[PDB]
Amino acid sequence: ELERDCRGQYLDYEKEEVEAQPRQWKKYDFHYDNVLWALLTLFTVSTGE
Amino acid sequence: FNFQDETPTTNFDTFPAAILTVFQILTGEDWNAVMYHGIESQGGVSKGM
């Protein structure tokens, strides 16, 4: 839960077979980090999708 | 809704969760996923439709 920690690799048990995946510090698709991004996020919320 | 491998966030366990789930079904978005969960909870398609 920090960008310092979120480096290297990790074991993913999602596939039901262990697989090593990279650790990526990502941002969500609709993310409110601006009044232009918040407008788009709120528009997509208002359309219901 | 305590399924194997997962527990949905849109569940009817407590009152805040139930009230939010009913609100989300009212707005119309993804009511079908909650329907599938509520059918699988009452036994399989076999006996809970």
Partner: protein, 49 residues
């Protein structure tokens, strides 16, 4: 559309769970699949059937 969502293409006679959550067909216009798989009967269907 009766009973058309039940042919999923399964591994090579291993009797394991089918690969992919989509119906298939052994015919020409339907969705073929790939990777040593056989489009055979008895898959409950999409969305738990």
């Amino acid at each position: 559309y009766m009973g058309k969502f039940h042919k999923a293409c399964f591994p090579n006679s291993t009797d394991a769970e089918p690969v992919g959550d989509f119906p298939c067909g052994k015919e020409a216009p339907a969705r073929l699949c790939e990777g040593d798989t056989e489009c055979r009967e008895y898959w409950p269907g999409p969305n738990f059937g």
